[PDB]
Design a binder for this molecule. Structure first.
Ligand SMILES: NS(=O)(=O)c1ccc(N/N=C2\C(=O)Nc3ccc(C(=O)O)cc32)cc1
Ligand SMILES: NS(=O)(=O)c1ccc(N/N=C2\C(=O)Nc3ccc(C(=O)O)cc32)cc1
Length: 293
């Protein structure tokens, strides 16, 4: 670690603290992530697999440094996250062609992850990174279930529940790649409307916000929902609202795709591969964002 000079702290999450840093050996500017914990052997092996999960839309994992019973991950550095870009673009909105490009690229990255049986599990605007060339990349995944212990909130953590799939909220512990499609759907809606789709601050508030818009799920729309671990027959039964309120003024192709990404039944929810073929992407392009760095 004496080979890195910290420039500034750029983030913190369940798995650690991220710094912008300079590699003293090469002069490179990188993102250095100190993993919050020595470190178990299963975590070293699982993280080593992430070094081989390489794609243009996945943040590059350059090196794994396991020394003095501490774990550091060295990643390539990108200058801005989607949360900041969304906030910077709040008065005008991100242009639809750029929203479409970002969605397409993130579906390409997820289709790749998913084909290798790797789930992101916690997609949110803060872990989607952008550059000046129009790329967007997935970050902050691959360490879940590798440390062998139940997840406990770290000191000062406030968990973001806004993008969590309903099956996670309902207590499914063996959920599928569909959870990432749900999260990406929520982010897509937020890019279009400039408002979070389901901004809950508790698990039940999150679940009830989903139900009030999409309707309380039942066995008709989601076979098996009533047998989910945290499903209660006492949930209020809200009717599904007319979808026209969800993402105005998005066109029917985008609304159709979003409705497939937000299906309750994870088995009915569209896959990343099928979403890439949706008519909404027939006119996809790769525009340049205006980034103020
Ligand atoms: N792939 S890259 O990001 O374009 C890049 C850029 C710069 C570098 N430099 N490497 C080195 C540099 O300047 N002094 C060095 C001293 C020692 C070593 C070494 O391997 O032992 C490497 C460098 C690499 C990649
Ligand atoms: N808020 S901001 O100023 O727009 C910002 C936020 C984040 C960044 N970079 N983050 C990262 C980066 O460059 N490589 C990474 C690799 C992994 C992780 C992670 O969390 O696991 C984060 C980053 C820059 C500016």
């Amino acid at each position: 670690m004496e080979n890195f000079q910290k420039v500034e702290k750029i983030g913190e999450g369940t798995y650690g603290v991220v710094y912008k840093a300079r590699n003293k050996l090469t002069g490179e500017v990188v993102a250095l992530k100190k993993i919050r914990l020595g470190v178990p052997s299963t975590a070293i092996r699982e993280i080593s697999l992430l070094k081989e999960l390489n794609h243009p839309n996945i943040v590059k994992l350059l090196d794994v440094i396991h020394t003095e019973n501490k774990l550091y991950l060295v990643f390539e550095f990108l200058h801005q996250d989607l949360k900041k870009f969304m906030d910077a673009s709040a008065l005008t909105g991100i242009p639809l062609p750029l929203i479409k490009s970002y969605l397409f690229q993130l579906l390409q990255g997820l289709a790749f992850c998913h084909s290798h049986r790797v789930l992101h599990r916690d997609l949110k605007p803060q872990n989607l990174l952008i550059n000046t060339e129009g790329a967007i990349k997935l970050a902050d995944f691959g360490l879940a279930r590798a440390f062998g212990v139940p997840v406990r909130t770290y000191t000062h953590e406030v968990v973001t529940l806004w993008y969590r799939a309903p099956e996670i909220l309902l207590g499914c512990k063996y959920y599928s790649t569909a959870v990432d499609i749900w999260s990406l759907g929520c982010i897509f809606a937020e890019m279009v409307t400039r408002r979070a789709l389901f901004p809950g601050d508790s698990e039940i508030d999150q679940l009830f916000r989903i139900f009030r818009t999409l309707g309380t799920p039942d066995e008709v729309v989601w076979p098996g929902v009533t047998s989910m671990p945290d499903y209660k027959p006492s949930f209020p039964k809200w009717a599904r609202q007319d979808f026209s309120k969800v993402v105005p003024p998005l066109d029917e192709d985008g609304r159709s795709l979003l409705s497939q990404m937000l299906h309750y039944d994870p088995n009915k929810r569209i896959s990343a591969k099928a979403a890439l073929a949706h008519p909404f992407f027939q006119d996809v392009t790769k525009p340049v964002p205006h980034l103020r760095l």
